[PDB]
Design a protein around this ligand. Structure first.
Ligand code: H2Z
Ligand code: ZN
Length: 299
């Protein structure tokens, strides 16, 4: 059978919150079967546990934030993207502060730390959410859609009227049958525009931000000196963001996501509509790895 996965070993990282600018210790630990991903604020008494689930999403301005009460865990999307892309079902994520560290602004540091520790298959059937019926949400020109698909595929289109964007670099489609999360998406860094970042800075937002954890784009160029990791890094990053947000379902998806200028807010509205639409999805398991439409790397 395809088995639930957790970590083989504890993983530890240090960094800074992109938005808060606070130093944060992150500790990933193994977790039992059917736990899901569960964030823990270890700086609080008592320690507050927030499942990484759609129902615990609060704020979706410039990040995906989980909330229990007024306890926040901010910027969960890049770490959850890493978790989803390596097929982790169960894990405790301990934070010493309200935000997940930004690291290099990608999921690469997280994928590397997790794969360093190794994955452990557990003696329970991995449960997948299969999309049975198309579900789409829209708000103005933004759109996000789940479509039935025998596999896991993510397509994303951005529309910036800007010298850096103008080309085929504005749409990408990744079929995880064909194409490695780790090699093609995981290293895609977050990005912002100089005028929007100056606005945020004026509001004492973006306190952890720099060219070391973000692609900074002005009116005409990428400001970062050392270049892009990918010709289409920007759209790849939005794909990374979508994978992380989608993982708030709590299970790997057998289905296709298509995003047009979608972000955390619309992704969350998509999850909420999917969840509500019980005819559009079913939970499945695979007795036999060989008949599954998804293959995950060896643990
Ligand atoms: C929502 C987004 C973007 C989210 N972002 C990307 C992002 C970058 C940023 C910044 C900054 C900054 C840069 C330079 C400086 C000058 N000094 C500062 C002091 O140290 C030396 C540099 C100060 C601040 C803030 N910021 C942010 O909110 C995402 O990826 N979600 O997961 S997306 C791509 O739109 O979907
Ligand atoms: Zn992001």
């Amino acid at each position: 059978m395809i088995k639930q996965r957790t970590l083989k070993n504890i993983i530890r990282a240090t960094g800074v919150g992109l938005h808060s600018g606070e130093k944060v210790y992150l500790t990933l630990k193994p977790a039992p079967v059917d736990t899901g991903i569960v964030f823990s604020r270890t700086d609080l008494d008592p320690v507050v546990e927030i499942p990484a689930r759609a129902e615990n999403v609060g704020e979706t301005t410039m990040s995906t934030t989980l909330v229990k009460g007024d306890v926040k865990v901010d910027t969960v999307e890049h770490l959850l993207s890493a978790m989803a892309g390596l097929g982790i079902d169960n894990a405790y994520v301990e934070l010493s502060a309200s935000e997940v560290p930004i690291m290099d602004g990608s999921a690469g540091p997280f994928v590397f730390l997790i794969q360093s520790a190794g994955l452990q298959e557990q003696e329970a059937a991995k449960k997948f959410i299969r999309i049975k019926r198309e579900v789409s949400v829209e708000e103005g020109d933004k759109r996000a859609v789940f479509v039935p698909f025998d596999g896991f595929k993510v397509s994303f289109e951005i529309d910036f009227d800007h010298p850096v964007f103008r080309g085929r670099t504005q749409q990408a489609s990744v079929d995880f049958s064909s194409t490695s999360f780790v090699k093609e998406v995981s290293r895609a860094r977050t990005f912002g525009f100089m005028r929007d970042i100056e606005y945020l800075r004026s509001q004492n937002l973006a306190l952890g931000g720099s060219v070391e954890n973000a692609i900074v784009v002005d009116e005409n160029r990428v400001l970062n000196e050392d270049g892009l990791r990918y010709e289409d890094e920007f759209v790849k990053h939005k794909i990374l963001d979508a994978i992380g947000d989608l993982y708030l379902l709590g299970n790997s998806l057998i289905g296709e996501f298509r995003g047009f200028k979608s972000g955390h807010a619309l992704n969350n509205q998509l999850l909420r509509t999917l969840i509500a639409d019980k005819d559009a999805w079913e939970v499945v398991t695979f007795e036999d790895a060989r008949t599954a439409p998804i293959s995950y790397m060896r643990p």
